[PDB]
Amino acid sequence: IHHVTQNGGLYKRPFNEAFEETPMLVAVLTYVGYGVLTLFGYLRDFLRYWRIEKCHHATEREEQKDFVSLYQDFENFYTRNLYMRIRDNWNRPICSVPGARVDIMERQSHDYNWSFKYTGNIIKGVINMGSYNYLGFARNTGSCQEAAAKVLEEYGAGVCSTRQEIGNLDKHEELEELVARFLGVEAAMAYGMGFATNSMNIPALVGKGCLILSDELNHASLVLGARLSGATIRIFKHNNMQSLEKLLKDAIVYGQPRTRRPWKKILILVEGIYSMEGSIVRLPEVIALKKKYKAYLYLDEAHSIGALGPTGRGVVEYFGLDPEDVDVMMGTFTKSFGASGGYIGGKKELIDYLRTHSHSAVYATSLSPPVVEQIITSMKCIMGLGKECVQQLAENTRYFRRRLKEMGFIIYGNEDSPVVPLMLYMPAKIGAFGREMLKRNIGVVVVGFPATPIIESRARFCLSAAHTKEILDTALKEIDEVGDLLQLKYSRHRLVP
Amino acid sequence: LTVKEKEELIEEWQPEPLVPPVPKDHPALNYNIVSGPPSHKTVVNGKECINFASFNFLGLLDNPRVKAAALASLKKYGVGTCGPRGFYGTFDVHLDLEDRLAKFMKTEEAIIYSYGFATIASAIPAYSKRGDIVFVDRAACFAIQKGLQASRSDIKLFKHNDMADLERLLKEQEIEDQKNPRKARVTRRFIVVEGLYMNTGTICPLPELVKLKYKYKARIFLEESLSFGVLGEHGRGVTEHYGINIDDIDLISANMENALASIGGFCCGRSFVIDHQRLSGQGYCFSASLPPLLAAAAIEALNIMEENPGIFAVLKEKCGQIHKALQGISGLKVVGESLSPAFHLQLEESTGSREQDVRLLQEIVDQCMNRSIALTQARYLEKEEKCLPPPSIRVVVTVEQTEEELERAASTIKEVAQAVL
Amino acid sequence: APAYHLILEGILILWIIRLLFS
Amino acid sequence: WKQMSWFYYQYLLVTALYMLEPWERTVFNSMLVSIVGMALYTGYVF
Amino acid sequence: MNSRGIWLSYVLAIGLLHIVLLSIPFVSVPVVWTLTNLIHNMGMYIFLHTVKGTPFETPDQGKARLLTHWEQMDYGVQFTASRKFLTITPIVLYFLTSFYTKYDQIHFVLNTVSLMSVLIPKLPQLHGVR
Ligand SMILES: CCCCCCCCCCCCCCCC(=O)CSCCNC(=O)CCNC(=O)[C@H](O)C(C)(C)COP(=O)(O)OP(=O)(O)OC[C@H]1O[C@@H](n2cnc3c(N)ncnc32)[C@H](O)[C@@H]1OP(=O)(O)O
Ligand SMILES: Cc1ncc(COP(=O)(O)O)c(CN[C@@H](CO)C(=O)O)c1O
């Protein structure tokens, strides 16, 4: 009732989302940075001929083995030239519970980041913005957390069988019925790994003569599980409804790729919160478009399930739709609920099929009994203090995003999407933004190349409902100081208040 | 071509439903609800019973020690991690379990995955690529068959447990070696074998298969997810059983779900090969790490193994006298070695139908639940399996089973085997 | 003022045009 | 002004030199001036 | 690729080479255009038609291990926005190194032969030929 489109998807609230176009001045300097590192990267290969000092890395047996190369020299030219140089920014070990302030072990390299040592002193109070702790359910002292985990812990350390033999305990069915009442579906089925939710149930549901309509930037599990099946895969542009409507009415009027035989079925693999970007799926324009062309939707929400919508009920509550338009909803219990595992959600016709024909149910082991009562005794913590931390998370995102935008930075994504990607469009500022904020006593996540485009190296700032106003103003005062130190304030538009 | 009026006319096309209409008759449509922990004396379907289908070979599930160490780590770390191990998601336990696991196998380095089925399906496609060759026992498990179908390489399967077929099949590749030696000097050869077979417990011959590794230039990818804490004087897998230096083997991958009684899987080797899976390991980097109350139960369970290493001896003698018992059984046979703790009770004379056979075997499994015994039959995906085994009962023996409860379990199954067949 | 260059040069100019429209 | 090190700091971030070694950072620093130092002579000639 | 950002950068590079190759105390001859043309076509042939494979792992199970940068790029499309730009530009240099070289008969064999080593692999009637 606010915005209707050429499709039919009627929006009920404004959809603000702007991706700023990288300035053309910065875009030249990137190449000089990636070019010079490539230039000096060879030299370390031409100096690897003498082999006087190869001690940094490892080698084959030589006397024994030494038959074939095993690794391609050019394949790994990026993990030993452009990565190993700034490798101290990712695998940082932790001494305590991850929740708005964490202990970091301090380490130090003498070989220019080829081997580390742990000094012995840890850094005590570090505001972390790299852990997924939506709704602050990651503590070690909680009524829900202490009671559920401890009683269950006496139960069993872990299961030792499979859901079709003796791997089905009484804890697994009282979860399943509870997940179904949460979302509003007929049934559900819990797995034990979100990465194996997607890469084991998609080849159960698609098969050979079918077509998969995948988005440009999915997670690696949807990409892997779509390849284990054997169906044709065609990739459309990120959040582009024009390039989905074209790519779908060209798949029906042309049938298969070698004959012209019609397809068996068409399903569309989308997402929810899109963390590497921060945008949200244009979900009223997919439901109003799949009904025109009679396809299926594999809506999946792992980064939204407890951070979007009035009562944290995924993206379907967000746009004002009922969970009946979509099929096979996916989800993980690691982001919002703070426990491992994933589910799938459907109708009994579908479920009864996945309890029978899925790869995980017959071959692999199930959830463990102490991580399943952390889910039961905290899912209940939302329906009822459960609606306060959802309202707190939604106003921490509005404050942190507008005040970070009025400083001149480039921020991708939607106005209400609790991952905030900050642009660092350069290779040397990847290793420097992560390194300078530790001096400033704050820990962040910097992702460069590989996952994203060459000229799109960014930084993530996953927020939380356990971050107070006094923690955010400590962080926003230091980003302003480390933004001027590295000149990261570039945007033609400055939203001055 | 294809006018706009004509194009819409083609929008009459109706698709198949997503899911086929599952019938009222199938295999395991109805799961066995189990009350309480799956311990020695379990209560399956409201019926006290002494089980023979759980995989805790060492006890270690309802251990007072193991459970005190997992609780001491629940009160200082919480339940779960929050990130995917490259983003603030490593604890002290993760780094300490990888140091301990590697020192327990006296190798150089180990790695940890948070799931049992994704430690091998993520390690085969990291090395094997599009232009390679793999030689597979053909009796391999499902977890191997989906890492092979993900690496996109030429896959050749030899016969089960013989070196005459795997020697026959390497020579055919050595003839295409010389008919194109320009591109036959850039295709690595691998061999994938299993330590003890889940589908049919038999031990593979390593001694005469390793000296064949130095003949032809082919690597070995051992996978001992079922012999890790069983075979050997110190329970170090199958390499301690035959007596082979660990440098000869390129990669060994188990799971921490059977003998360690927990969740997860590892993969230990040399540092020249293990350091590549940290950036290309599919289930390693794009997945949240193992929770820290499961990593403290795996250190303490690995503690107990070494405290008293004589337990492995009362696991080998245990699985020898139940293999001698079930021999006179008329109607069905025993498939397995005298060292393997997981032999199958295959059907001796088949009718001529898988459906008709599955149901026949169930009659026995449903009947023995009335008594002290509890046992299951092996489940498989017939549509997807490459080589499908025959239907069978799986009989697992642990250390917490006495001699009084083994002859009771063999005489009972011998009695109701002639009442169905 | 090319000795034999113009003949070669003429082909190139035409070559661009038929390549440009594709 | 001692804040010339800030100008030198920007020169390191706008290129890959910052995340580069100590003995290998002057290789680029020598040639850079060598390529400019030959452009100073020709400005006096032609 | 950034369709104005990449192209532009390439243009810059060439220029840089020209000004790094030019203004040399030793040789102040207008035969730097031949030098320019000489370095650039041998530089393109290495990084677009010789080096085989990707510069980083995990693309698609080594699908393009036996492919060249000019083959794999743009998913093999014959005439994309970029396929044309990387072939129109090596021949525009040939117009510039002839207005200044005065149609040298000694440099004609050192310029065209360097032109045919690049233009001929860019023909769509070749592809997989090694
Ligand atoms: C300074 C450096 C710093 C280093 C940074 C280190 C970071 C530290 C690690 C921290 C760990 C954090 C992890 C948390 C995870 C997270 O927080 C979200 S991060 C998760 C995001 N992950 C990724 O996106 C990786 C996978 N994505 C791709 O790989 C892309 O797709 C490419 C464009 C690259 C392929 O481009 P391409 O390879 O040129 O295209 P192909 O066709 O060759 O692809 C080969 C086959 O895949 C199919 N396919 C490609 N796309 C597809 C798609 N969209 N949908 C369906 N199928 C697709 C093709 O049809 C081919 O099918 P087949 O022919 O049947 O084999
Ligand atoms: C569709 C889909 N499936 C799976 C995952 C991750 O799986 P997990 O449940 O094993 O973390 C994600 C998010 N992936 C995050 C995990 O926090 C990551 O950083 O990799 C996803 O969007």
XYZ file of N, CA, C and O in Angstrom, chain B residues 233-312:
320
model
N 47.911 -51.998 19.596
C 48.203 -52.195 21.004
C 47.867 -50.920 21.751
O 47.401 -50.959 22.885
N 48.107 -49.785 21.106
C 47.837 -48.491 21.712
C 46.676 -47.795 21.025
O 46.472 -46.597 21.202
N 45.926 -48.549 20.231
C 44.785 -48.006 19.520
C 45.120 -46.773 18.711
O 44.611 -45.693 18.979
N 45.979 -46.938 17.714
C 46.385 -45.833 16.861
C 45.955 -46.114 15.433
O 46.545 -45.609 14.484
N 44.910 -46.918 15.295
C 44.398 -47.318 13.997
C 44.982 -48.613 13.451
O 45.401 -49.507 14.186
N 45.012 -48.697 12.120
C 45.435 -49.911 11.436
C 46.932 -49.905 11.163
O 47.523 -50.974 10.953
N 47.572 -48.739 11.203
C 48.985 -48.658 10.875
C 49.846 -49.250 11.977
O 50.925 -49.781 11.703
N 49.298 -49.272 13.185
C 49.968 -49.861 14.329
C 49.730 -51.371 14.329
O 50.497 -52.127 14.920
N 48.666 -51.806 13.656
C 48.315 -53.222 13.588
C 49.226 -53.986 12.639
O 49.615 -55.122 12.925
N 49.567 -53.361 11.520
C 50.435 -53.978 10.530
C 51.888 -53.597 10.764
O 52.797 -54.310 10.353
N 52.100 -52.467 11.430
C 53.440 -51.988 11.713
C 54.011 -51.250 10.522
O 54.901 -51.749 9.838
N 53.499 -50.051 10.272
C 53.949 -49.250 9.144
C 54.241 -47.810 9.554
O 53.458 -47.190 10.270
N 55.374 -47.287 9.107
C 55.743 -45.917 9.421
C 54.661 -44.974 8.922
O 54.201 -45.095 7.796
N 54.289 -43.989 9.733
C 53.235 -43.041 9.354
C 53.568 -42.042 8.237
O 52.674 -41.367 7.738
N 54.839 -41.930 7.857
C 55.244 -41.027 6.792
C 54.874 -41.596 5.428
O 54.695 -40.849 4.467
N 54.756 -42.917 5.346
C 54.398 -43.573 4.097
C 53.005 -43.160 3.628
O 52.776 -42.978 2.436
N 52.079 -43.014 4.570
C 50.710 -42.614 4.259
C 50.638 -41.092 4.160
O 51.245 -40.389 4.957
N 49.903 -40.586 3.177
C 49.780 -39.148 2.970
C 48.733 -38.430 3.817
O 48.954 -37.304 4.247
N 47.596 -39.069 4.053
C 46.527 -38.440 4.809
C 45.717 -39.507 5.522
O 45.449 -40.568 4.962
N 45.370 -39.228 6.775
C 44.538 -40.084 7.610
C 43.433 -39.218 8.189
O 43.713 -38.165 8.765
N 42.184 -39.643 8.030
C 41.062 -38.859 8.515
C 40.078 -39.757 9.235
O 39.620 -40.749 8.670
N 39.741 -39.410 10.460
C 38.775 -40.170 11.228
C 37.610 -39.268 11.582
O 37.453 -38.182 11.033
N 36.764 -39.738 12.484
C 35.794 -38.870 13.118
C 35.781 -39.118 14.616
O 36.056 -40.223 15.088
N 35.489 -38.061 15.359
C 35.457 -38.131 16.812
C 34.058 -38.448 17.309
O 33.546 -37.793 18.206
N 33.427 -39.467 16.736
C 32.051 -39.797 17.064
C 31.870 -41.234 17.503
O 30.886 -41.530 18.184
N 32.794 -42.124 17.173
C 32.646 -43.529 17.488
C 33.395 -43.912 18.758
O 32.768 -44.268 19.754
N 34.721 -43.854 18.734
C 35.504 -44.228 19.907
C 35.626 -43.101 20.921
O 35.690 -43.346 22.120
N 35.650 -41.864 20.441
C 35.771 -40.710 21.325
C 34.430 -40.291 21.920
O 34.385 -39.495 22.855
N 33.348 -40.833 21.369
C 31.996 -40.542 21.827
C 31.727 -39.055 21.970
O 31.498 -38.565 23.071
N 31.768 -38.343 20.852
C 31.508 -36.913 20.834
C 31.147 -36.502 19.414
O 30.824 -37.349 18.587
N 31.196 -35.207 19.127
C 30.854 -34.719 17.801
C 32.050 -34.062 17.129
O 32.762 -33.287 17.754
N 32.277 -34.384 15.861
C 33.370 -33.798 15.124
C 34.155 -34.832 14.359
O 33.853 -36.021 14.365
N 35.175 -34.347 13.670
C 36.060 -35.215 12.923
C 37.383 -34.515 12.758
O 37.466 -33.289 12.832
N 38.442 -35.294 12.600
C 39.755 -34.714 12.418
C 40.399 -35.274 11.173
O 39.798 -36.061 10.461
N 41.630 -34.861 10.926
C 42.372 -35.260 9.736
C 43.831 -34.932 9.991
O 44.192 -33.756 10.005
N 44.662 -35.939 10.205
C 46.040 -35.685 10.588
C 46.985 -36.173 9.505
O 46.722 -37.162 8.820
N 48.087 -35.475 9.358
C 49.097 -35.849 8.392
C 50.384 -35.132 8.663
O 50.769 -34.921 9.810
N 51.047 -34.784 7.564
C 52.291 -34.025 7.549
C 51.915 -32.559 7.363
O 50.809 -32.243 6.937
N 52.826 -31.641 7.636
C 52.435 -30.240 7.518
C 52.461 -29.706 6.097
O 51.921 -28.624 5.861
N 53.001 -30.473 5.164
C 53.036 -30.044 3.780
C 51.669 -30.221 3.121
O 51.375 -29.570 2.123
N 50.823 -31.077 3.694
C 49.514 -31.350 3.114
C 48.384 -30.792 3.978
O 47.345 -30.390 3.444
N 48.575 -30.721 5.298
C 47.486 -30.295 6.173
C 47.279 -28.788 6.088
O 46.143 -28.308 6.144
N 48.342 -28.019 5.867
C 48.250 -26.565 5.783
C 47.511 -26.058 4.554
O 47.322 -24.845 4.438
N 47.110 -26.922 3.633
C 46.375 -26.480 2.465
C 44.876 -26.510 2.679
O 44.149 -25.764 2.020
N 44.423 -27.314 3.626
C 43.007 -27.415 3.905
C 42.478 -26.266 4.741
O 41.274 -26.151 4.927
N 43.354 -25.412 5.253
C 42.861 -24.335 6.085
C 42.289 -23.202 5.263
O 41.491 -22.418 5.783
N 42.657 -23.113 3.991
C 42.121 -22.089 3.117
C 41.223 -22.637 2.030
O 40.418 -21.886 1.482
N 41.357 -23.922 1.721
C 40.545 -24.541 0.681
C 39.596 -25.611 1.208
O 38.827 -26.186 0.450
N 39.659 -25.889 2.504
C 38.774 -26.872 3.097
C 37.376 -26.294 3.129
O 37.099 -25.369 3.885
N 36.493 -26.837 2.304
C 35.123 -26.347 2.218
C 34.403 -26.223 3.558
O 33.967 -25.143 3.929
N 34.273 -27.328 4.279
C 33.581 -27.320 5.555
C 34.365 -26.756 6.719
O 33.885 -26.755 7.847
N 35.575 -26.284 6.450
C 36.424 -25.706 7.479
C 36.220 -24.206 7.566
O 35.981 -23.664 8.648
N 36.381 -23.516 6.447
C 36.355 -22.068 6.483
C 34.950 -21.499 6.353
O 34.628 -20.546 7.055
N 34.086 -22.066 5.527
C 32.736 -21.515 5.421
C 31.760 -22.192 6.380
O 30.676 -22.588 5.971
N 32.126 -22.285 7.656
C 31.305 -22.968 8.640
C 31.784 -22.601 10.027
O 32.979 -22.416 10.248
N 30.844 -22.517 10.960
C 31.199 -22.235 12.338
C 31.923 -23.424 12.946
O 31.680 -24.574 12.590
N 32.833 -23.133 13.863
C 33.745 -24.139 14.367
C 33.059 -25.030 15.396
O 31.879 -24.875 15.710
N 33.817 -25.974 15.929
C 33.272 -26.937 16.865
C 33.057 -26.275 18.225
O 33.894 -25.485 18.663
N 31.920 -26.542 18.889
C 31.646 -25.862 20.162
C 32.585 -26.317 21.243
O 33.039 -27.472 21.265
N 32.921 -25.438 22.197
C 34.015 -25.728 23.121
C 33.662 -26.644 24.275
O 34.548 -26.942 25.077
N 32.417 -27.078 24.423
C 32.145 -28.118 25.402
C 32.294 -29.502 24.802
O 32.370 -30.484 25.540
N 32.343 -29.593 23.479
C 32.641 -30.840 22.800
C 34.129 -31.048 22.603
O 34.557 -32.183 22.389
N 34.920 -29.983 22.641
C 36.360 -30.109 22.521
C 37.034 -30.400 23.850
O 38.161 -30.896 23.859
N 36.382 -30.111 24.968
C 36.921 -30.509 26.259
C 36.540 -31.927 26.639
O 37.216 -32.532 27.474
N 35.475 -32.464 26.057
C 35.170 -33.871 26.236
C 36.042 -34.757 25.371
O 36.173 -35.945 25.667
N 36.634 -34.213 24.313
C 37.514 -34.991 23.459
C 38.947 -35.018 23.955
O 39.693 -35.925 23.583
N 39.359 -34.048 24.771
C 40.689 -34.108 25.364
C 40.705 -35.095 26.515
O 41.646 -35.882 26.660
N 39.663 -35.079 27.344
C 39.623 -35.968 28.496
C 39.427 -37.413 28.074
O 39.999 -38.320 28.684
N 38.653 -37.644 27.015
C 38.487 -38.999 26.499
C 39.774 -39.523 25.887
O 40.006 -40.732 25.872
N 40.622 -38.627 25.394
C 41.894 -39.006 24.804
C 42.965 -39.220 25.860
O 43.958 -39.898 25.590
N 42.642 -38.730 27.055
C 43.422 -38.834 28.274
C 43.301 -40.256 28.757
O 44.290 -40.959 28.935
N 42.052 -40.667 28.968
C 41.700 -41.998 29.454
C 42.280 -43.139 28.632
O 42.695 -44.150 29.181
N 42.297 -42.981 27.313
C 42.850 -43.996 26.429
C 44.281 -44.333 26.832
O 44.636 -45.502 26.952
N 45.102 -43.306 27.016
C 46.508 -43.496 27.363
C 46.782 -43.869 28.818
O 47.804 -44.484 29.110
N 45.890 -43.487 29.729
C 46.070 -43.817 31.139
C 46.177 -45.327 31.273
O 47.106 -45.846 31.888
N 45.217 -46.024 30.682
C 45.207 -47.477 30.679
C 44.961 -47.939 29.253
O 43.840 -47.888 28.766
N 46.022 -48.391 28.570
C 45.951 -48.850 27.184
C 45.708 -50.347 27.078
O 45.851 -50.913 25.998
N 45.343 -50.976 28.189
C 45.065 -52.399 28.214
C 43.598 -52.677 27.960
O 43.180 -53.829 27.910
N 42.812 -51.617 27.806
C 41.391 -51.753 27.541
C 41.190 -52.277 26.128
O 40.270 -53.042 25.866
N 42.060 -51.864 25.216
C 41.966 -52.315 23.838
C 42.053 -53.832 23.783
O 41.536 -54.448 22.862
